[PDB]
Amino acid sequence: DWPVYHRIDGPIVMIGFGSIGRGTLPLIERHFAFDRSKLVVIDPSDEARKLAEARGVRFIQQAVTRDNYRELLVPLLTAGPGQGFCVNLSVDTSSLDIMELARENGALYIDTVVEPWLGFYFDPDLKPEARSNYALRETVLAARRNKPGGTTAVSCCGANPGMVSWFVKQALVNLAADLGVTGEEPTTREEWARLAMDLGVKGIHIAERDTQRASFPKPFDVFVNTWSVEGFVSEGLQPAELGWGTFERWMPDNARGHDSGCGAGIYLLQPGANTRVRSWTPTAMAQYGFLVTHNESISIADFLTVRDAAGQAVYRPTCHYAYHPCNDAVLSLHEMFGSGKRQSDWRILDETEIVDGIDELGVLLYGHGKNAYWYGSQLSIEETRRIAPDQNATGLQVSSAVLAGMVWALENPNAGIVEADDLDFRRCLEVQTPYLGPVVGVYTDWTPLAGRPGLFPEDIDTSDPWQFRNVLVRD
Amino acid sequence: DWPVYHRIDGPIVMIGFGSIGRGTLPLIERHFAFDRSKLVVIDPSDEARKLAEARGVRFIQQAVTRDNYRELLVPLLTAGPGQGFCVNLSVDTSSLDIMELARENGALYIDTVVEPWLGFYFDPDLKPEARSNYALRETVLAARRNKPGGTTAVSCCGANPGMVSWFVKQALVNLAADLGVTGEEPTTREEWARLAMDLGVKGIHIAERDTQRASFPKPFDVFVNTWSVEGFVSEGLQPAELGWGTFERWMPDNARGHDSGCGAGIYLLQPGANTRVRSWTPTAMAQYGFLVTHNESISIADFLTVRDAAGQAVYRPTCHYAYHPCNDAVLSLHEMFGSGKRQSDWRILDETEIVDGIDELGVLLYGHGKNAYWYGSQLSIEETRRIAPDQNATGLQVSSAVLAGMVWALENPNAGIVEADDLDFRRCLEVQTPYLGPVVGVYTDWTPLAGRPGLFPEDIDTSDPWQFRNVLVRD
Ligand SMILES: NC(=O)c1ccc[n+]([C@@H]2O[C@H](COP(=O)([O-])OP(=O)(O)OC[C@H]3O[C@@H](n4cnc5c(N)ncnc54)[C@H](O)[C@@H]3O)[C@@H](O)[C@H]2O)c1
Ligand SMILES: NC(=O)c1ccc[n+]([C@@H]2O[C@H](COP(=O)([O-])OP(=O)(O)OC[C@H]3O[C@@H](n4cnc5c(N)ncnc54)[C@H](O)[C@@H]3O)[C@@H](O)[C@H]2O)c1
């Protein structure tokens, strides 16, 4: 039967019971020992309340806000007898503030995004840089510098960000092995960064193709997705953003850097969900992805940075999302951007509504001697239904990653604020893999210059096919 | 009963029997008196042959080519006893050469596109300008100058190009009434151009939204459309192209004009089916259209050009397509452009396969005192099935326009080479209207600057919402 990894000796407070909370709850119940009355879900939605009631779990129907979060969460997380676990799977709440509160009170913490308090993403007085995931991530890095060590809090540990950081490490090990390079696997950040440098990894796409399809066609004026519509649209309207590689020799006129922080990022002055990049996955082959900002675009590039003695970056990979969401989401973006406003309504596809498909999610490492290598999960909806309830394939990759991070945090409970890049990738993948379906590594000879130039002039760099100049879709 | 407009006494030579030929044949049989044995259908495909054989119509299984067209077509066109009618609904054939051959032999002629001989659309030695619909149309204008008058040949008389020219005239009449502009209805090209100028029509979109949906979801690696896949992809890979208004104050860096010809056009050095424009239809409301090149973008702008005594253009409207095809076609374009190559397979949706939807096809006249006015057809698939066989709503708008043009040609058989803009629009609409479903005029206060500027800096012209600078979507 299913492994029970650890006892949780305190309250389990799940903030948010949307598509990810609904998929994560059964995994927590399955894989951890605790008295049932220890678990409580907090979500303002009536829909969520009804589902929670049907699942027999405690539910508090309340929005967590800047004004109530201390009064609500401190008693809940400290109810005892020992250390609780805040499992934050919400929108509209501050990851930073909730994380800090959990830490101050000795509770473990995990989330899947650096979310801000409601109001931030559309605040007209914020400059684009301030709305970037680079800037949100810097608040977490600052919190870590301010209070090193202490109770473990895991930032951005879903499928992506999250699992994909573990895939990058496995992909690097595999690339080395496939070249006949043997020996000790890297242990330290610096060693991982040098492995990427030494292997000639110029950049990495988080290369995803969701092929899940519903039993009904996309309704007019309804945004359809396989996970948070609100969350997808919010990140989609943030600036396009990427970890920026040392090999790059061109950026768009509307690209901008940052004065401060880890140094690994640029952003573009346009919304990422209306920015296209040329990319590739094994099932899609060549496809457009949307250049939607993601925490790991920065965190992976930062993690794999090699600096010289003076502290100057001398190697860093480009890293960004290249997302092809489900067909109905593609249509939803075309509708939304074409209308200039959010649809009147939205819906998230339930497993009962999905007729077939997979969430093909992996990392595409390029520029090395074998050109490009994609490593990741090809989890299908049919396998999903066999192995975990109340979610689709998109959901299960995320919920199983939260499970893995929770196991890691319980096993390493004094590690301080950590990113997915800081965790033991082998342990995390050991926990997660039973929920990932086929996990495969595939080489390809495809590059962004395949078939180009066509019959129109274009600005391309034929000396270096994977340059962002060639990847970015431009007029 | 259905009106039988005229007897056709000579051969009826239908070149091509794909979606439009299949929809047009039954209308020809319905609306003209003739011995069925005088029909002949020419198409290279087995699929077409079996359909023709099922209708008990003479069929010749040949591709018409530059090498064979004279020897193949002349005996068919001249078989007698009376004047024949060449109904050209093909791909890969020269409209110009076939039209000239028909005229040389006294046969009436109609088509729905200025098609070139196979090889043109992908010829790598052609400069972009030479690949343009403007250039193709100029070959037709030159033929007309070289041989004025004579046997009628109707160029580009489908739904669009074709019908939409008649809609422009009706829309101008309606606007004049609604704006209280006095004067008699124009009866010459010069008078129509002056009316458009006097009404302050800055430009016109051919504003189309196809909402037809099939009973099966879009297959991976299959291009799906409601009419010619080959034809749509060919025009989609031609340069984006538009009739260019005198009111425009800006064009993109990759726009180009023409050194010769009617003077009415520009094109962009990028493919039209991967070029988006902000537009509007009554059912879509605000939407993206694709800026796919079309004959009428040039012909309507040219028709409505006012020149001074010296012959310099002092007024001309912008005119271009703003096409939102069916959702499966939108996905097909994303797939094709994302892959960098045509899909392995394609299919045209049959009425038996379509579950619901309309082809909302009209003209959006903007810049006048009531902002914007859309006039056109909202034909549904359900109405289509009630009134005509063997076609979907897209096909019926086209086949019924061909019918109208054929009636007009029989009633005006010595009018020379004519475009849809040259035909008597009321007679054509009188014939066509029974097949158009609801035909309506709708005003809107929408403009391309609605909601702008938003979250990011944009390169807009706030002085005039309808400038192309505001309409064109930048990547
Ligand atoms: N890293 C990844 O791989 C990954 C993947 C998917 C989702 N996510 C993130 O996880 C979060 C949840 O995604 P989802 O698909 O479950 O979203 P969802 O939209 O399905 O659910 C969000 C839930 O948050 C609740 N909520 C709203 N305001 C709240 C508040 N003030 N307090 C508490 N709850 C509140 C809503 O009622 C809703 O049930 C989102 O932030 C999303 O961006 C991360
Ligand atoms: N103006 C408009 O509104 C409008 C609308 C739709 C289509 N069209 C045009 O009408 C034409 C027909 O469209 P469709 O949807 O019927 O296309 P289709 O692709 O369904 O059919 C094209 C037919 O042409 C035949 N063909 C190919 N090569 C040939 C040759 N050398 N000689 C004779 N026949 C040949 C094919 O075998 C096929 O049956 C296309 O050129 C298209 O661009 C115009």
Numbering used by the authors:
A (entry chain A), B (entry chain B): 3 to 477
What does the published report state?
In contrast to its eukaryotic counterparts, bacterial HSS synthesizes 1 mol HSP from 2 mol PUT. NAD+ serves as a non-covalently bound prosthetic group for BvHSS. The interface area of the dimer was calculated as approximately 1700 Å2 by PDBsum indicating a stable dimer23. The BvHSS subunit consists of two domains as determined by CATH24: one “NAD(P)-binding Rossmann-like” domain (domain 1, residues 3–163 and 394–425) and one “homospermidine-synthase-like domain” (domain 2, residues 164–395 and 426–477) as shown in Fig. 2a and S1. The crystal structures of BvHSS containing NAD+ clearly show that the active site is localized inside each subunit.
